[PDB]
Amino acid sequence: ETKCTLKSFTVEKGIYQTSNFRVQPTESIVRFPNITNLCPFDEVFNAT
Amino acid sequence: DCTMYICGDSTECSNLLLQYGSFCTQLKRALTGIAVEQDKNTQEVFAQV
């Protein structure tokens, strides 16, 4: 990683800074609220 | 850090960053030179013995 951060194959003695430590995104999800206020179409469908 | 500052945690922008390319690397070498110097300014004063 530090060899290809400097774009070279030989690195001199010292301390070097490289890419970070971050977790790659594994999955993806969605959420939305809906528990009440149902539309009453049953009265039309239950009327003789 | 180059990538995380502008569009961190967004892989759809990181590939776009490669278009400009070596622009941010020039910033890292500029800020790293400042940090190394600060450790020499203290050495010149207090370490004369």
PDB file of N, CA and C in Angstrom:
ATOM      1  N   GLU A   1       0.825  -1.202   0.000  1.00  0.00           N
ATOM      2  CA  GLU A   1       0.000   0.000   0.000  1.00  0.00           C
ATOM      3  C   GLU A   1       0.863   1.257   0.000  1.00  0.00           C
ATOM      4  N   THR A   2       1.914   1.277   0.823  1.00  0.00           N
ATOM      5  CA  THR A   2       2.782   2.452   0.845  1.00  0.00           C
ATOM      6  C   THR A   2       3.718   2.485  -0.357  1.00  0.00           C
ATOM      7  N   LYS A   3       3.964   1.337  -0.992  1.00  0.00           N
ATOM      8  CA  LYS A   3       4.743   1.333  -2.227  1.00  0.00           C
ATOM      9  C   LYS A   3       3.958   1.969  -3.364  1.00  0.00           C
ATOM     10  N   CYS A   4       2.669   1.655  -3.458  1.00  0.00           N
ATOM     11  CA  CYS A   4       1.850   2.197  -4.532  1.00  0.00           C
ATOM     12  C   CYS A   4       1.205   3.528  -4.176  1.00  0.00           C
ATOM     13  N   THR A   5       1.328   3.979  -2.927  1.00  0.00           N
ATOM     14  CA  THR A   5       0.918   5.339  -2.593  1.00  0.00           C
ATOM     15  C   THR A   5       1.933   6.353  -3.106  1.00  0.00           C
ATOM     16  N   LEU A   6       3.211   5.976  -3.124  1.00  0.00           N
ATOM     17  CA  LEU A   6       4.272   6.842  -3.618  1.00  0.00           C
ATOM     18  C   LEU A   6       4.572   6.628  -5.093  1.00  0.00           C
ATOM     19  N   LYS A   7       3.900   5.673  -5.743  1.00  0.00           N
ATOM     20  CA  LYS A   7       4.128   5.353  -7.153  1.00  0.00           C
ATOM     21  C   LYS A   7       5.593   5.001  -7.408  1.00  0.00           C
ATOM     22  N   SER A   8       6.089   4.021  -6.655  1.00  0.00           N
ATOM     23  CA  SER A   8       7.463   3.563  -6.793  1.00  0.00           C
ATOM     24  C   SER A   8       7.579   2.166  -6.204  1.00  0.00           C
ATOM     25  N   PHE A   9       8.703   1.517  -6.490  1.00  0.00           N
ATOM     26  CA  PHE A   9       8.963   0.169  -6.005  1.00  0.00           C
ATOM     27  C   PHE A   9      10.018   0.126  -4.909  1.00  0.00           C
ATOM     28  N   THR A  10      10.717   1.232  -4.662  1.00  0.00           N
ATOM     29  CA  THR A  10      11.685   1.318  -3.579  1.00  0.00           C
ATOM     30  C   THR A  10      11.333   2.500  -2.691  1.00  0.00           C
ATOM     31  N   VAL A  11      11.309   2.263  -1.382  1.00  0.00           N
ATOM     32  CA  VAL A  11      10.970   3.286  -0.401  1.00  0.00           C
ATOM     33  C   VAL A  11      12.124   3.424   0.582  1.00  0.00           C
ATOM     34  N   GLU A  12      12.522   4.665   0.847  1.00  0.00           N
ATOM     35  CA  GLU A  12      13.604   4.949   1.775  1.00  0.00           C
ATOM     36  C   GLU A  12      13.103   4.887   3.216  1.00  0.00           C
ATOM     37  N   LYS A  13      14.051   4.807   4.148  1.00  0.00           N
ATOM     38  CA  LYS A  13      13.708   4.701   5.560  1.00  0.00           C
ATOM     39  C   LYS A  13      12.959   5.941   6.027  1.00  0.00           C
ATOM     40  N   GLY A  14      11.898   5.726   6.795  1.00  0.00           N
ATOM     41  CA  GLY A  14      11.129   6.832   7.331  1.00  0.00           C
ATOM     42  C   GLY A  14       9.735   6.370   7.718  1.00  0.00           C
ATOM     43  N   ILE A  15       8.868   7.352   7.946  1.00  0.00           N
ATOM     44  CA  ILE A  15       7.462   7.127   8.262  1.00  0.00           C
ATOM     45  C   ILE A  15       6.634   7.707   7.123  1.00  0.00           C
ATOM     46  N   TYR A  16       5.601   6.979   6.710  1.00  0.00           N
ATOM     47  CA  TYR A  16       4.791   7.356   5.562  1.00  0.00           C
ATOM     48  C   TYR A  16       3.315   7.280   5.920  1.00  0.00           C
ATOM     49  N   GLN A  17       2.516   8.132   5.286  1.00  0.00           N
ATOM     50  CA  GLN A  17       1.074   8.147   5.479  1.00  0.00           C
ATOM     51  C   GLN A  17       0.382   7.531   4.270  1.00  0.00           C
ATOM     52  N   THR A  18      -0.595   6.667   4.537  1.00  0.00           N
ATOM     53  CA  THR A  18      -1.253   5.899   3.488  1.00  0.00           C
ATOM     54  C   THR A  18      -2.765   6.077   3.544  1.00  0.00           C
ATOM     55  N   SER A  19      -3.499   5.246   2.801  1.00  0.00           N
ATOM     56  CA  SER A  19      -4.956   5.304   2.797  1.00  0.00           C
ATOM     57  C   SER A  19      -5.507   5.017   4.188  1.00  0.00           C
ATOM     58  N   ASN A  20      -6.802   5.239   4.385  1.00  0.00           N
ATOM     59  CA  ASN A  20      -7.377   5.223   5.722  1.00  0.00           C
ATOM     60  C   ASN A  20      -7.954   3.847   6.049  1.00  0.00           C
ATOM     61  N   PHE A  21      -8.644   3.764   7.185  1.00  0.00           N
ATOM     62  CA  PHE A  21      -9.209   2.527   7.704  1.00  0.00           C
ATOM     63  C   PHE A  21     -10.721   2.690   7.744  1.00  0.00           C
ATOM     64  N   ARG A  22     -11.379   2.410   6.620  1.00  0.00           N
ATOM     65  CA  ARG A  22     -12.821   2.576   6.506  1.00  0.00           C
ATOM     66  C   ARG A  22     -13.435   1.305   5.938  1.00  0.00           C
ATOM     67  N   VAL A  23     -14.583   0.932   6.494  1.00  0.00           N
ATOM     68  CA  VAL A  23     -15.271  -0.307   6.155  1.00  0.00           C
ATOM     69  C   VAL A  23     -16.034  -0.104   4.853  1.00  0.00           C
ATOM     70  N   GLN A  24     -15.822  -1.010   3.890  1.00  0.00           N
ATOM     71  CA  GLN A  24     -16.527  -0.968   2.619  1.00  0.00           C
ATOM     72  C   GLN A  24     -18.011  -1.275   2.814  1.00  0.00           C
ATOM     73  N   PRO A  25     -18.887  -0.600   2.071  1.00  0.00           N
ATOM     74  CA  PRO A  25     -20.329  -0.815   2.247  1.00  0.00           C
ATOM     75  C   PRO A  25     -20.758  -2.213   1.827  1.00  0.00           C
ATOM     76  N   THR A  26     -21.277  -2.962   2.800  1.00  0.00           N
ATOM     77  CA  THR A  26     -21.701  -4.338   2.569  1.00  0.00           C
ATOM     78  C   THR A  26     -23.082  -4.451   1.936  1.00  0.00           C
ATOM     79  N   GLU A  27     -24.053  -3.660   2.383  1.00  0.00           N
ATOM     80  CA  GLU A  27     -25.433  -3.832   1.941  1.00  0.00           C
ATOM     81  C   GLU A  27     -26.085  -2.460   1.805  1.00  0.00           C
ATOM     82  N   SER A  28     -27.407  -2.460   1.642  1.00  0.00           N
ATOM     83  CA  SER A  28     -28.195  -1.244   1.505  1.00  0.00           C
ATOM     84  C   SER A  28     -29.638  -1.541   1.889  1.00  0.00           C
ATOM     85  N   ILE A  29     -30.288  -0.615   2.629  1.00  0.00           N
ATOM     86  CA  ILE A  29     -31.699  -0.823   3.111  1.00  0.00           C
ATOM     87  C   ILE A  29     -32.545   0.457   2.973  1.00  0.00           C
ATOM     88  N   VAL A  30     -33.868   0.375   3.220  1.00  0.00           N
ATOM     89  CA  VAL A  30     -34.803   1.550   3.146  1.00  0.00           C
ATOM     90  C   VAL A  30     -35.815   1.451   4.305  1.00  0.00           C
ATOM     91  N   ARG A  31     -36.317   2.578   4.846  1.00  0.00           N
ATOM     92  CA  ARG A  31     -37.422   2.542   5.858  1.00  0.00           C
ATOM     93  C   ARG A  31     -38.412   3.709   5.695  1.00  0.00           C
ATOM     94  N   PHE A  32     -39.723   3.478   5.899  1.00  0.00           N
ATOM     95  CA  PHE A  32     -40.748   4.565   5.858  1.00  0.00           C
ATOM     96  C   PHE A  32     -41.926   4.232   6.793  1.00  0.00           C
ATOM     97  N   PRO A  33     -42.583   5.208   7.472  1.00  0.00           N
ATOM     98  CA  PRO A  33     -43.659   4.921   8.455  1.00  0.00           C
ATOM     99  C   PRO A  33     -45.094   4.789   7.914  1.00  0.00           C
ATOM    100  N   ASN A  34     -45.874   3.780   8.352  1.00  0.00           N
ATOM    101  CA  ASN A  34     -47.204   3.484   7.817  1.00  0.00           C
ATOM    102  C   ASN A  34     -47.834   2.389   8.680  1.00  0.00           C
ATOM    103  N   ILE A  35     -48.627   2.805   9.667  1.00  0.00           N
ATOM    104  CA  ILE A  35     -49.235   1.882  10.615  1.00  0.00           C
ATOM    105  C   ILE A  35     -50.730   2.131  10.776  1.00  0.00           C
ATOM    106  N   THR A  36     -51.227   3.287  10.340  1.00  0.00           N
ATOM    107  CA  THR A  36     -52.623   3.645  10.557  1.00  0.00           C
ATOM    108  C   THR A  36     -53.170   4.340   9.319  1.00  0.00           C
ATOM    109  N   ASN A  37     -54.364   4.918   9.479  1.00  0.00           N
ATOM    110  CA  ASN A  37     -55.034   5.697   8.443  1.00  0.00           C
ATOM    111  C   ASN A  37     -55.237   4.895   7.163  1.00  0.00           C
ATOM    112  N   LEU A  38     -55.806   3.699   7.284  1.00  0.00           N
ATOM    113  CA  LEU A  38     -56.060   2.875   6.110  1.00  0.00           C
ATOM    114  C   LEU A  38     -57.251   3.414   5.325  1.00  0.00           C
ATOM    115  N   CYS A  39     -57.160   3.332   3.999  1.00  0.00           N
ATOM    116  CA  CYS A  39     -58.247   3.774   3.145  1.00  0.00           C
ATOM    117  C   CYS A  39     -59.407   2.781   3.193  1.00  0.00           C
ATOM    118  N   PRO A  40     -60.615   3.262   3.487  1.00  0.00           N
ATOM    119  CA  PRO A  40     -61.788   2.372   3.622  1.00  0.00           C
ATOM    120  C   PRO A  40     -62.482   2.086   2.294  1.00  0.00           C
ATOM    121  N   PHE A  41     -61.906   1.166   1.519  1.00  0.00           N
ATOM    122  CA  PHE A  41     -62.564   0.675   0.314  1.00  0.00           C
ATOM    123  C   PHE A  41     -63.414  -0.564   0.564  1.00  0.00           C
ATOM    124  N   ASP A  42     -63.436  -1.085   1.793  1.00  0.00           N
ATOM    125  CA  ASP A  42     -64.203  -2.297   2.063  1.00  0.00           C
ATOM    126  C   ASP A  42     -65.702  -2.032   2.014  1.00  0.00           C
ATOM    127  N   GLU A  43     -66.126  -0.822   2.387  1.00  0.00           N
ATOM    128  CA  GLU A  43     -67.550  -0.499   2.364  1.00  0.00           C
ATOM    129  C   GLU A  43     -68.112  -0.584   0.952  1.00  0.00           C
ATOM    130  N   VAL A  44     -67.358  -0.095  -0.036  1.00  0.00           N
ATOM    131  CA  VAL A  44     -67.757  -0.265  -1.429  1.00  0.00           C
ATOM    132  C   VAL A  44     -67.780  -1.743  -1.797  1.00  0.00           C
ATOM    133  N   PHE A  45     -66.767  -2.491  -1.360  1.00  0.00           N
ATOM    134  CA  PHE A  45     -66.649  -3.902  -1.703  1.00  0.00           C
ATOM    135  C   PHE A  45     -67.509  -4.809  -0.833  1.00  0.00           C
ATOM    136  N   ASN A  46     -68.146  -4.272   0.209  1.00  0.00           N
ATOM    137  CA  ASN A  46     -69.048  -5.050   1.050  1.00  0.00           C
ATOM    138  C   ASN A  46     -70.453  -4.459   1.075  1.00  0.00           C
ATOM    139  N   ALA A  47     -70.881  -3.834  -0.018  1.00  0.00           N
ATOM    140  CA  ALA A  47     -72.224  -3.278  -0.084  1.00  0.00           C
ATOM    141  C   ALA A  47     -73.070  -4.051  -1.086  1.00  0.00           C
ATOM    142  N   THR A  48     -74.207  -4.566  -0.612  1.00  0.00           N
ATOM    143  CA  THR A  48     -75.080  -5.347  -1.481  1.00  0.00           C
ATOM    144  C   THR A  48     -75.875  -4.450  -2.421  1.00  0.00           C
TER     145      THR A  48
ATOM    146  N   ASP B   1      -6.964  14.589   4.711  1.00  0.00           N
ATOM    147  CA  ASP B   1      -7.087  13.467   3.793  1.00  0.00           C
ATOM    148  C   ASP B   1      -7.727  13.909   2.482  1.00  0.00           C
ATOM    149  N   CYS B   2      -7.227  13.344   1.380  1.00  0.00           N
ATOM    150  CA  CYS B   2      -7.702  13.726   0.053  1.00  0.00           C
ATOM    151  C   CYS B   2      -9.181  13.408  -0.129  1.00  0.00           C
ATOM    152  N   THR B   3      -9.520  12.120  -0.141  1.00  0.00           N
ATOM    153  CA  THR B   3     -10.838  11.652  -0.548  1.00  0.00           C
ATOM    154  C   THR B   3     -11.940  11.934   0.456  1.00  0.00           C
ATOM    155  N   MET B   4     -11.678  11.758   1.753  1.00  0.00           N
ATOM    156  CA  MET B   4     -12.756  11.800   2.733  1.00  0.00           C
ATOM    157  C   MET B   4     -13.292  13.211   2.935  1.00  0.00           C
ATOM    158  N   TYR B   5     -12.474  14.233   2.683  1.00  0.00           N
ATOM    159  CA  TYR B   5     -12.924  15.598   2.935  1.00  0.00           C
ATOM    160  C   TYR B   5     -14.022  16.017   1.965  1.00  0.00           C
ATOM    161  N   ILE B   6     -13.823  15.785   0.670  1.00  0.00           N
ATOM    162  CA  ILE B   6     -14.714  16.351  -0.339  1.00  0.00           C
ATOM    163  C   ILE B   6     -15.999  15.536  -0.482  1.00  0.00           C
ATOM    164  N   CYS B   7     -15.902  14.220  -0.667  1.00  0.00           N
ATOM    165  CA  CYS B   7     -17.089  13.379  -0.776  1.00  0.00           C
ATOM    166  C   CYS B   7     -16.922  12.070  -0.020  1.00  0.00           C
ATOM    167  N   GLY B   8     -16.474  12.142   1.231  1.00  0.00           N
ATOM    168  CA  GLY B   8     -16.202  10.958   2.021  1.00  0.00           C
ATOM    169  C   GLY B   8     -17.341   9.962   2.098  1.00  0.00           C
ATOM    170  N   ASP B   9     -16.997   8.673   2.077  1.00  0.00           N
ATOM    171  CA  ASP B   9     -17.962   7.579   2.118  1.00  0.00           C
ATOM    172  C   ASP B   9     -18.984   7.684   0.993  1.00  0.00           C
ATOM    173  N   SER B  10     -18.505   7.864  -0.236  1.00  0.00           N
ATOM    174  CA  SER B  10     -19.346   7.871  -1.427  1.00  0.00           C
ATOM    175  C   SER B  10     -18.507   7.400  -2.604  1.00  0.00           C
ATOM    176  N   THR B  11     -18.630   6.115  -2.946  1.00  0.00           N
ATOM    177  CA  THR B  11     -17.770   5.532  -3.969  1.00  0.00           C
ATOM    178  C   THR B  11     -18.106   6.030  -5.370  1.00  0.00           C
ATOM    179  N   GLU B  12     -19.295   6.596  -5.565  1.00  0.00           N
ATOM    180  CA  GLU B  12     -19.694   7.144  -6.853  1.00  0.00           C
ATOM    181  C   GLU B  12     -19.001   8.464  -7.164  1.00  0.00           C
ATOM    182  N   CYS B  13     -18.400   9.103  -6.162  1.00  0.00           N
ATOM    183  CA  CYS B  13     -17.617  10.316  -6.361  1.00  0.00           C
ATOM    184  C   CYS B  13     -16.118  10.062  -6.367  1.00  0.00           C
ATOM    185  N   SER B  14     -15.655   9.013  -5.680  1.00  0.00           N
ATOM    186  CA  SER B  14     -14.225   8.737  -5.612  1.00  0.00           C
ATOM    187  C   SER B  14     -13.633   8.473  -6.990  1.00  0.00           C
ATOM    188  N   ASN B  15     -14.360   7.764  -7.855  1.00  0.00           N
ATOM    189  CA  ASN B  15     -13.881   7.551  -9.216  1.00  0.00           C
ATOM    190  C   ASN B  15     -13.853   8.857  -9.998  1.00  0.00           C
ATOM    191  N   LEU B  16     -14.790   9.764  -9.710  1.00  0.00           N
ATOM    192  CA  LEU B  16     -14.764  11.080 -10.338  1.00  0.00           C
ATOM    193  C   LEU B  16     -13.528  11.868  -9.929  1.00  0.00           C
ATOM    194  N   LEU B  17     -13.042  11.662  -8.703  1.00  0.00           N
ATOM    195  CA  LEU B  17     -11.860  12.371  -8.231  1.00  0.00           C
ATOM    196  C   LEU B  17     -10.616  12.032  -9.038  1.00  0.00           C
ATOM    197  N   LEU B  18     -10.541  10.822  -9.599  1.00  0.00           N
ATOM    198  CA  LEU B  18      -9.378  10.436 -10.391  1.00  0.00           C
ATOM    199  C   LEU B  18      -9.227  11.276 -11.651  1.00  0.00           C
ATOM    200  N   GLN B  19     -10.294  11.943 -12.098  1.00  0.00           N
ATOM    201  CA  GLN B  19     -10.190  12.844 -13.236  1.00  0.00           C
ATOM    202  C   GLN B  19      -9.205  13.978 -12.993  1.00  0.00           C
ATOM    203  N   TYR B  20      -9.332  14.699 -11.881  1.00  0.00           N
ATOM    204  CA  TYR B  20      -8.334  15.683 -11.486  1.00  0.00           C
ATOM    205  C   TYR B  20      -7.009  15.041 -11.095  1.00  0.00           C
ATOM    206  N   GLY B  21      -7.037  14.004 -10.278  1.00  0.00           N
ATOM    207  CA  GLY B  21      -5.870  13.150 -10.069  1.00  0.00           C
ATOM    208  C   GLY B  21      -4.888  13.745  -9.067  1.00  0.00           C
ATOM    209  N   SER B  22      -3.735  14.189  -9.564  1.00  0.00           N
ATOM    210  CA  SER B  22      -2.595  14.527  -8.719  1.00  0.00           C
ATOM    211  C   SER B  22      -2.708  15.907  -8.086  1.00  0.00           C
ATOM    212  N   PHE B  23      -3.906  16.493  -8.094  1.00  0.00           N
ATOM    213  CA  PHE B  23      -4.073  17.812  -7.496  1.00  0.00           C
ATOM    214  C   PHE B  23      -3.954  17.760  -5.977  1.00  0.00           C
ATOM    215  N   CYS B  24      -4.611  16.790  -5.343  1.00  0.00           N
ATOM    216  CA  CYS B  24      -4.626  16.727  -3.887  1.00  0.00           C
ATOM    217  C   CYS B  24      -3.321  16.206  -3.303  1.00  0.00           C
ATOM    218  N   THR B  25      -2.634  15.296  -3.993  1.00  0.00           N
ATOM    219  CA  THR B  25      -1.330  14.823  -3.553  1.00  0.00           C
ATOM    220  C   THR B  25      -0.337  15.959  -3.344  1.00  0.00           C
ATOM    221  N   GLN B  26      -0.412  17.011  -4.159  1.00  0.00           N
ATOM    222  CA  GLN B  26       0.407  18.198  -3.943  1.00  0.00           C
ATOM    223  C   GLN B  26       0.072  18.873  -2.617  1.00  0.00           C
ATOM    224  N   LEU B  27      -1.173  18.742  -2.155  1.00  0.00           N
ATOM    225  CA  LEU B  27      -1.547  19.333  -0.874  1.00  0.00           C
ATOM    226  C   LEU B  27      -0.970  18.541   0.291  1.00  0.00           C
ATOM    227  N   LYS B  28      -0.967  17.210   0.188  1.00  0.00           N
ATOM    228  CA  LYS B  28      -0.419  16.381   1.255  1.00  0.00           C
ATOM    229  C   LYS B  28       1.062  16.641   1.486  1.00  0.00           C
ATOM    230  N   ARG B  29       1.855  16.746   0.423  1.00  0.00           N
ATOM    231  CA  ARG B  29       3.268  17.064   0.564  1.00  0.00           C
ATOM    232  C   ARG B  29       3.500  18.481   1.062  1.00  0.00           C
ATOM    233  N   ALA B  30       2.556  19.392   0.820  1.00  0.00           N
ATOM    234  CA  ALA B  30       2.688  20.748   1.335  1.00  0.00           C
ATOM    235  C   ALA B  30       2.419  20.805   2.834  1.00  0.00           C
ATOM    236  N   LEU B  31       1.374  20.117   3.297  1.00  0.00           N
ATOM    237  CA  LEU B  31       1.052  20.118   4.719  1.00  0.00           C
ATOM    238  C   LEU B  31       2.009  19.251   5.525  1.00  0.00           C
ATOM    239  N   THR B  32       2.583  18.215   4.909  1.00  0.00           N
ATOM    240  CA  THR B  32       3.531  17.374   5.629  1.00  0.00           C
ATOM    241  C   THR B  32       4.859  18.084   5.843  1.00  0.00           C
ATOM    242  N   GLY B  33       5.241  18.973   4.927  1.00  0.00           N
ATOM    243  CA  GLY B  33       6.452  19.751   5.131  1.00  0.00           C
ATOM    244  C   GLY B  33       6.337  20.702   6.306  1.00  0.00           C
ATOM    245  N   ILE B  34       5.141  21.249   6.528  1.00  0.00           N
ATOM    246  CA  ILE B  34       4.921  22.134   7.670  1.00  0.00           C
ATOM    247  C   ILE B  34       5.087  21.365   8.974  1.00  0.00           C
ATOM    248  N   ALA B  35       4.527  20.155   9.037  1.00  0.00           N
ATOM    249  CA  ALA B  35       4.552  19.386  10.277  1.00  0.00           C
ATOM    250  C   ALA B  35       5.970  18.986  10.663  1.00  0.00           C
ATOM    251  N   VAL B  36       6.787  18.595   9.685  1.00  0.00           N
ATOM    252  CA  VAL B  36       8.162  18.204   9.983  1.00  0.00           C
ATOM    253  C   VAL B  36       8.960  19.401  10.484  1.00  0.00           C
ATOM    254  N   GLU B  37       8.697  20.585   9.927  1.00  0.00           N
ATOM    255  CA  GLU B  37       9.427  21.779  10.335  1.00  0.00           C
ATOM    256  C   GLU B  37       9.147  22.135  11.791  1.00  0.00           C
ATOM    257  N   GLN B  38       7.896  21.977  12.234  1.00  0.00           N
ATOM    258  CA  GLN B  38       7.544  22.335  13.605  1.00  0.00           C
ATOM    259  C   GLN B  38       8.342  21.537  14.626  1.00  0.00           C
ATOM    260  N   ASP B  39       8.772  20.327  14.270  1.00  0.00           N
ATOM    261  CA  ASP B  39       9.594  19.535  15.173  1.00  0.00           C
ATOM    262  C   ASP B  39      11.050  19.971  15.168  1.00  0.00           C
ATOM    263  N   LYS B  40      11.463  20.764  14.178  1.00  0.00           N
ATOM    264  CA  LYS B  40      12.833  21.258  14.144  1.00  0.00           C
ATOM    265  C   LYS B  40      12.947  22.624  14.808  1.00  0.00           C
ATOM    266  N   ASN B  41      11.871  23.414  14.775  1.00  0.00           N
ATOM    267  CA  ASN B  41      11.890  24.716  15.434  1.00  0.00           C
ATOM    268  C   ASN B  41      12.101  24.578  16.934  1.00  0.00           C
ATOM    269  N   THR B  42      11.434  23.614  17.564  1.00  0.00           N
ATOM    270  CA  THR B  42      11.629  23.334  18.978  1.00  0.00           C
ATOM    271  C   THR B  42      13.021  22.800  19.288  1.00  0.00           C
ATOM    272  N   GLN B  43      13.586  21.969  18.414  1.00  0.00           N
ATOM    273  CA  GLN B  43      14.916  21.411  18.612  1.00  0.00           C
ATOM    274  C   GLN B  43      16.016  22.464  18.610  1.00  0.00           C
ATOM    275  N   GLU B  44      15.953  23.449  17.713  1.00  0.00           N
ATOM    276  CA  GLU B  44      16.962  24.494  17.641  1.00  0.00           C
ATOM    277  C   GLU B  44      17.058  25.345  18.898  1.00  0.00           C
ATOM    278  N   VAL B  45      15.963  25.510  19.639  1.00  0.00           N
ATOM    279  CA  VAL B  45      15.977  26.396  20.797  1.00  0.00           C
ATOM    280  C   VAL B  45      16.449  25.662  22.046  1.00  0.00           C
ATOM    281  N   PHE B  46      15.731  24.618  22.458  1.00  0.00           N
ATOM    282  CA  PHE B  46      15.938  24.011  23.766  1.00  0.00           C
ATOM    283  C   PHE B  46      17.063  22.986  23.807  1.00  0.00           C
ATOM    284  N   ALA B  47      17.566  22.535  22.661  1.00  0.00           N
ATOM    285  CA  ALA B  47      18.546  21.451  22.603  1.00  0.00           C
ATOM    286  C   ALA B  47      19.954  21.951  22.304  1.00  0.00           C
ATOM    287  N   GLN B  48      20.342  23.094  22.860  1.00  0.00           N
ATOM    288  CA  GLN B  48      21.670  23.654  22.645  1.00  0.00           C
ATOM    289  C   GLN B  48      22.703  23.145  23.646  1.00  0.00           C
ATOM    290  N   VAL B  49      22.431  22.035  24.330  1.00  0.00           N
ATOM    291  CA  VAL B  49      23.345  21.488  25.323  1.00  0.00           C
ATOM    292  C   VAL B  49      23.532  19.998  25.076  1.00  0.00           C
TER     293      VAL B  49
END
